[PDB]
Amino acid sequence: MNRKWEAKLKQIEERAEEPPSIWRLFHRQAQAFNFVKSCKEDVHVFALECKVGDGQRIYLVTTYAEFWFYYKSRKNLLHCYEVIPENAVCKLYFDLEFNKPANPGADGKKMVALLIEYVCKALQELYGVNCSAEDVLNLDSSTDEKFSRHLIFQLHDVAFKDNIHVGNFLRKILQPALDLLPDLSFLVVKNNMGEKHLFVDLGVYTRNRNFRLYKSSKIGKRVALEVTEDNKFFPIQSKDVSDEYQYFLSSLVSNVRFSDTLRILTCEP
DNA sequence: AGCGCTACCACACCCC
DNA sequence: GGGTGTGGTAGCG
Ligand SMILES: Nc1ncnc2c1ncn2[C@H]1C[C@H](O)[C@@H](COP(=O)(O)OP(=O)(O)OP(=O)(O)O)O1
Ligand SMILES: [Ca+2]
């Protein structure tokens, strides 16, 4: 109840035959989610970075299908982000990154593989869920200085109550590595200034977290997220949709497969 | 006209 | 000297 108060109190201050199409832009994030409620269509909220170098964002509301239609060519709608709605069920995902200069002998492949091998073990012990690297969409946005990878888990009929509970799960199973201010040593890496922190970014599990979309780049640079070469997740091939659209749907954190046997995973801190 | 939030420091308090 | 709860802005993500 304390969260919805900050949203309502910020709102009072902020105010002081064509084919079926839905394409609404909103200056405020709250306005977008309000429209989603009074919509009835399977619509979702995206965030676009404005030409301003800062993180100033505008919020687009439309379906996953229509969005990809005006987005697949990559001539327009660059620097887009998925708004992971709070309280909404979502997939297990990761934001992985370390500074290459400050970490000479850190192999990016073995680190992500060992990380997956560990989380999969954790999913088995705590929740009985079983999966392997074959269920992990591996994306890359690395440069010559930053090894940047996004992992989106594609679990069979499983999801988390929301992204906050995802964070409680990772802080829990990554506590052995958090103590290093289960041999989770490969997680520790030297940051920008040689300070030792974790290979896993635990700051992407907040309410209404933006998350850069598949084939999008930050407004600054020009390196877009793309599927790695060692990725082991392959969507099912369908004749009614393109393979790129399959990866796009898989990459969406808040696009949980509709299933009549869905298990919702929770985790309190 | 983005939206969330904690890492950090400062202070106030208590304890034998 | 240690230890614990409270503000409150700067700054990351
Ligand atoms: N100023 C911001 N405002 C809102 N959301 C942000 C902001 N900065 C980062 N985020 C969100 C979107 C990002 O996809 C998410 C992860 O942060 P970040 O690591 O800086 O971007 P990224 O991981 O997608 O690219 P990369 O790590 O390769 O630089 O946090
Ligand atoms: Ca990142």
| Helix, strand, coil percent values for chain A (each to nearest 5) | 30, 20, 50
Annotate A200-209 with b (16+ C-beta within 10 A) or e (fewer).
beeebbeebb
**The dihedral sign for the CA sequence A49, A52, A58, A62:** negative
Probe target for ligand 1 pocket from A98, A189, A212, A226, with the most ligand atoms within 8 Å of CB: A212
In a domain, A267, yes or no: no
**By residue range, what is the domain housing residue A107?**
93-198
Indicate whether A11 belongs to any domain. no
Same domain, A119 and A182: yes
Ligand 1 centroid – CA A131 distance (Å): 27
Is residue A95 packed enough to be buried (19+ CB in 10 Å), middle (13-18) or exposed (0-12)?
middle
Question: Are residue A190 and residue A224 in the same domain, yes or no?
Answer: no
- A243 and A176 inside one domain: no
Do residues A193 and A71 lie in contact, with contact meaning Cβ atoms separated by under 8 Å? no
Structure determined via: X-ray
Rounded Cα distance between A150 and A136, Å, is 10
Residues A129 and A190 in one domain: yes
Q: Is the C-beta of residue A27 closer than 7 Å to nucleic acid chain B?
A: yes
A73 found inside a domain:
yes
Specify if A22 maps to a domain: yes
Verify that A182 and A113 share a domain, yes or no.
yes
Minimum-distance ligand 1 atom for the alpha carbon of A97:
27
Could you tell me if residue A99 is inside a domain?
yes
> CA separation (Å) from A230 to A2, A43, A63, A78, A112?
44, 33, 30, 25, 11
Residues belonging to chain A = 269
Residue A263 lies in a domain: no
Q: What is the resolution of this structure in A?
A: 2.4
Question: A232, A221 in Cβ contact below 8 A?
Answer: no
Shared domain check, A28 and A160? no
Distance CA A222, CA A233 (A): 25
User: What's the domain count of chain A?
Assistant: 2
Distance CA A111, CA A116 (A): 9
Contacts 24+ apart (CB under 8 A), A220-227: A220/A53, A221/A143, A223/A141, A223/A142, A223/A143, A224/A74, A224/A78, A224/A141, A225/A139, A225/A140, A225/A141, A225/A150, A225/A251, A226/A139, A226/A140, A226/A141, A227/A137, A227/A138, A227/A139, A227/A140
CA end-to-end distance (rounded Å), chain A: 18
Whether residue A156 is found in the same domain as residue A185: yes
Residues A176 and A252 in one domain: no
A148 in any annotated domain: yes
Please choose from A95, A215, A223 the residue to mutate so as to test ligand 1's pocket, defined by most ligand atoms within 8 A of CB: A95
Q: Which of A149, A164, A159 is nearest to A204 (CA)?
A: A164
A158 and A178 in a single domain? The answer is yes
User: Residue A113 and residue A62: Cα distance in Å, rounded?
Assistant: 35
CA distance A83 to A115: 25
Instruction: Give nearest nucleotide to A204 (CA–C1').
Output: C13
Ligand 1 pocket residue status of A177, Cβ below 6 Å: no
Query: Contact, A62 vs A39, CB < 8 A?
Result: no
Q: Is residue A124 part of a domain?
A: yes
